[PDB]
C-alpha cells in the first residue's frame, strides 16, 4: 500500500510465480487473489 | 359507402400463424375450477381459452424441460362464453366449450346442530 497515491493506485499486489500447479512467472490473472485479500484489495474494507 | 357483405369472419390468412398450428390445434373454452386448497372464488369469474398439451421432453444437458409448440403458455381471458366462441371461430380454431359450473345454493342452519330427534345433531363443536 501507499496512501500518497491517488485512489485506485494506493494498493497493489505482486503475484506469486507458482500457484497450485502452474508456472505463473508471466501468466498472472486476477482470479489468483484469495477472498480475504480480494476484499482488502478491492477497497471493500479498510482492514487487511 | 358500405359493402353489406354477409359471410362469417375469417382472419386466418392475416394472422401469420403457420398452417399446422391452425387446423390441428384444439382449444378449450371454460371457466377454471376453484382451487380446493382455498375457499376464495375470485379466480372463477372469467372465461379462459387454452390450447391442447403437446410433447414436453427432457433436455439432454442439465435435464430441463424442452418443448416444441409456441402455444403452450397462451391463455386468453373473456367476459362471456360467446366472446370466446366468436374469437375461436374468427381465428379458425376448433374448440370444445364447457358450461360454467355454479355451486348450488345450500340450506344452512346453526340450530340444526342441536337437534332434538334428528340425526343432524353434532357430538361435539
Amino acid at each position: 500500500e501507499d496512501n500518497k497515491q491517488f485512489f485506485g493506485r494506493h494498493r497493489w499486489v505482486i503475484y506469486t510465480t507458482e500457484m497450485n500447479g502452474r508456472d505463473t512467472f508471466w501468466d498472472v490473472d486476477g482470479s489468483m487473489v484469495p477472498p480475504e485479500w480480494h476484499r482488502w484489495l478491492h477497497c471493500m474494507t479498510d482492514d487487511p | 359507402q358500405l359493402i353489406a357483405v354477409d359471410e362469417k369472419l375469417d382472419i386466418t390468412t392475416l394472422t401469420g400463424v403457420p398452417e399446422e398450428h391452425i387446423k390441428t390445434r384444439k382449444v378449450r373454452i371454460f371457466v377454471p375450477a376453484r382451487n380446493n386448497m382455498q375457499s376464495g372464488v375470485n379466480n372463477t369469474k372469467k372465461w379462459k381459452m387454452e390450447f391442447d398439451t403437446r410433447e414436453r421432453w427432457e433436455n439432454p444437458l442439465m435435464g430441463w424441460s424442452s418443448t416444441a409448440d409456441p402455444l403452450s403458455n397462451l391463455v386468453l381471458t373473456f367476459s362471456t362464453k360467446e366472446d370466446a366462441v366468436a374469437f375461436a371461430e374468427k381465428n379458425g380454431w376448433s374448440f370444445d366449450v364447457e358450461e360454467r359450473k355454479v355451486p348450488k345454493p345450500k340450506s344452512k342452519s346453526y340450530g340444526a346442530n342441536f337437534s332434538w330427534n334428528k340425526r343432524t345433531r353434532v357430538s361435539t363443536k
Binding site: - | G16, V17, P18, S66, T67, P70, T77, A86
Partner: protein, 208 residues
Amino acid sequence: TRPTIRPRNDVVHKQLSAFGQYVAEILPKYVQQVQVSCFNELEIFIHPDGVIPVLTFLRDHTNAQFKSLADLTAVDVPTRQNRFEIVYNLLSLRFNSRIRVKTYTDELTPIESSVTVYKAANWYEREIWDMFGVFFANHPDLRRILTDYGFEGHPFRKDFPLSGYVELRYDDEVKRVVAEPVELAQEFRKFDLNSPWEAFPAYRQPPE
C-alpha cells in the same frame, strides 16, 4: 389520509370535468363519453369517424390548443367486438394540460391517418400497424418499422406467442442465416399468480 396516501387535488379535477363537458358540448357528433380519473386525468371516448375532426379541434381551438402529440398507441382487448383501441395523448403548453382521446377498431376496419394533424403520428401509426395490424387510411408510407423483413403476424396481439413462431440460426450447408420453427431448450415457465379473495371492493362487478 396520513403521509403514506397520495394527496388529492380537487381544483384540477373540477377544471378537467368542466373542460370535458365543454368539449363534449362542442362535438356531439363524435364524442361518446367523457371521464376524469381519481388522479386527475381526462379521457374522451369518441367514434372512429371523428378522429380527424376532434383532434383538429383540440389542436386548433383557442381554448384547448393541444399542439403537441405526446404519444399514440394501441391496446388489444380480445374479448371485445372491436378488438383494438387507439389511444391519443396530447399536451397543451399554453394551458399546461394533458388530454386523452380513445377510439376503437377491429382487424379489417381502417382508421383514418392523422398525419395531416400531427407530423409525429407518422411513425406511431407505422408501429401500430406493425404490432397490432391496424391499417391506417391515407398514410404517406405504411410499412413495418420494428419487426424483421418478411415477418409474419403481429407480436403485440394477445393471441401471438411470447417466443413467436420462428427462430434464426446459421447453417453452414447453405452458408447463411436460416429460420426454423421455435424449439426452446427450456420452456418458459408459466406462473399462476392471481389469487382469490379480491383486493379492491370498489371495482366489484355485478353478478349477472
